[model samples]
Target chain A: DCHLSDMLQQLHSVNASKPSERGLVRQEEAEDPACIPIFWVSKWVDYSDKYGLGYQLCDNSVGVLFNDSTRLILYNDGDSLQYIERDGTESYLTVSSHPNSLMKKITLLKYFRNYMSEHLLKAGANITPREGDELARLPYLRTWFRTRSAIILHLSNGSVQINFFQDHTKLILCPLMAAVTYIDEKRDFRTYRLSLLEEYGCCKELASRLRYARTMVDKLLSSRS
Target chain B: TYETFDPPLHSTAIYADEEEFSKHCGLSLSSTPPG
Candidate 1:
């Protein structure tokens, strides 16, 4: 709980320091080739009490939990990386310097999105993945979907679940998917996990671009050795 | 800080269609029907 609180505080501080950009960005506006398409969803219990904003990055392949800041939580297949700045110390958790790791991270996110839509959404719930620009304007809709509880069915890439009430009023059942693995930082035999926020399909074009970038970097690194 | 409450259940089955209800509630479609 303390770790969670600390992480939240750091996120809040980072957010405050940066002049608030529009909380959600349009897909067209995010045309920068290097950046992944990330969508924001904010959940609130009340105006005063709420969970920090959550992000769906890389077409809902990667979901950032309580992501009020710019720092990234990345899962590369079996490894986990948390980019954070706490106190005055900036740190990275198990971030690989190797270029292959970058490619794997992208692949992992793609698999996560596919697993949720194909397996989880089919098994139960009627929620469909949102287009990048669909909920871009209505930021609060994302928040509403996150707070509700539903049956989380587990899978190989991870688990997929949609939020539903006991009365069976199914809220928008956006596929929430996660992958589990152990991280080096904790070394406590606990698994590091990542989840997807919504079902925006992965962008094949972006994936290919990243693959090419990784290949170029791999070539350069190998030549030096 | 604020708390949220659930609405009253008029029936055990939320969806009128049995298949929809089963899928939404994570129940096996082949299992016993909801009372």
Candidate 2:
């Protein structure tokens, strides 16, 4: 009764015209879903050399940076489903229709979505949307790779950051908002307004992560010297 | 221009086997093979 592809196509078609539903996962936590404005990598796997890296965004979107360097986003539009990918040198197919030869790729992409949704824990608070031009757009993973000490990510929203420290903390830098959020070992998150990081005294682990945050993000800026 | 990082024997570490990383899940699926 299912080919995985059709299972999803029909699943979405029914929901396409209707409002999206929320699972108990989001229902269980974060009493207030404020726009924290920082996105963190809730989960990631680096198989990029052979396959690609798959990541779950804090916003619940699943993304894969394929070994071929093309990007695929299985967006998290409540009560809706849509496909997002890059330019012409790349390609795309709507689930309801596609050639059999293309089936493997489409099916694999869906599995990537399933993998993230089932395995990864969602990071950051899920920001409920609002109306405005200056509003926060859904951020997508632009680039990601690891350093000896951490994993670095560049997001389309100018929020480049790090995840997977031995201590289990994260540092996210929002360039446009000019703020930095240091998710603690306890997994609690609080943002320090950029330079205000210095204004607030050291908090142990963050002093280290925050320093590397600017140093890594600044590696782009310091080319001047 | 900058030096990056590691976990020892990291290159040897494959995250999952096949059809098993997460919902589809990890390890053993290499880029060349097309699982």
Candidate 3:
């Protein structure tokens, strides 16, 4: 009974603090005209109440969660290192890194992008990787994507923050594609800087030609049947 | 036998409390157990 009561209390407290106050107090309960009513005023009041209670509500945000001990160890060991893994018979490999901070994530994303581009060119893909001013603008959009994926980070501050859906998605996808392109070229894991598309097919024309040839062969076989 | 519950040969990892682990891992403790 205590557990159920405690749960209800917590839920009620949270509900009271939401952006809307409708659920906080029933509509028929009171007709207090003094209540400052505004568009979504109830919602704001609910949120304000929650904020006042100092509840660390976990929302959609990206952050790392680590204990103080782990944080110290990680920091001492150099805030981050890239993780690479490959399974047998797999064409692509996965590369991951623990970005200790926002800046670190940005740096890693850039490195992965450059590595992908160089290799993409080598693989005969004429895609131009963003650089300079373009690269500078990536953080906001990157943050946007990271939040999308709701990436959570456990800060050194003893609080956990959730990244929104968008930003988190980018964080996962950005390095993923880079790693994929890298593996496509059959490059060594140690040599992450190789350009995969240079010798393969750099342009739409080359890609189309390859596809057309394959299709033509398939069609000929089908006709013979 | 060693594969079941061997201690770390080197440094041990930081084991988190139930709250910390579930919140961080985005996992719910109130779930079905593994078979």
Candidate 4:
């Protein structure tokens, strides 16, 4: 089952903290076996070396803002799982998985289409279906099966950011496409069927939800000015 | 102020026993706080 509510509450609590004194909200302890999933915390804001994570709602805007090289995560802390290598980065020795929910799967697709469309448009390139798929086929995009709503976007330059899609969509298109491909390739048979439009199908259910999201983004962008 | 006399607050709980703490908090020993 998706722990969407728990993840949202954690996000709200995180946003409520003062900027300089920010701290992480514990979703699970080191002893707990369960993990939080992608959809539960999908939206992310800006992260600076100084100000940390900032919240933004617009898909196009947030995508352009924090598009960089950084690997952000919500990781487990266990003696067996946690160790430091010869390099500075810490390593964990455990594998956890969570299956995606129907809604989460749809959200993942829609996020990819919009983000990729935006990225392509900004870069003065036409959006072809294959290029979209190629963009999605990056190495770092990850989702854990046990944490159903949690999604991680591992960018090409070796920066991975963790997003719990609590309020809005994060990664929009590129990483989302990568996530679908990752799940698709994980099977030995490679038999899962996902369509281009279906992968981008967040708007098909109802216009009202999309409109509400648009309104929220409009206000969010205006507030930044 | 009289408030100045109050002891500093730390998250560590002091209880005579598990039962005492649970009773004071109006909770059963088995009931953990939600994350």
Pick the DockQ winner: 2
Best-first order by lDDT: 2, 1, 4, 3
- Between candidates 2 and 4, the one scoring higher on lDDT is 2
lDDT of 3 at A33: 22
Weakest lDDT window of 10 consecutive positions for candidate 4 chain A: A184-193
TM-score of chain B of 4: 0.29
lDDT of 1: 0.27
Q: How many residue pairs collide in each prediction? A: 2, 17, 61, 32
Q: Is candidate 1 or candidate 4 better by lDDT?
A: 1
User: For residues A1-225, what per-residue lDDT tens digits would candidate 4 score against the true structure?
Assistant: 112222233223322332123133221111111111122212332223322231111112222111232222222121112222223354433323322222222222233323333322221011112322223322222211112333343332222233333422222212222212111111111111112222222222112222332333333334434
Stretches of candidate 4 off by over 4 Å are A1-74, A78-204, B1-35
How accurate locally, in lDDT, is each candidate? 0.27, 0.52, 0.21, 0.25
> What are the interface RMSDs of all the models?
15.5, 10.6, 17.3, 21.7
Clashing pairs in 1: A42-A143, A43-A143
DockQ of 3: 0.02
What lDDT score is found at residue A99 in candidate 3?
36
Better of 2 and 3 by DockQ: 2
Q: Looking at candidate 4, what is the lDDT of residue A70?
A: 26
Sorted on TM-score, best first, the list reads 2, 1, 4, 3
Residue A71 CA error for candidate 2 (Å)?
Answer: 0.7
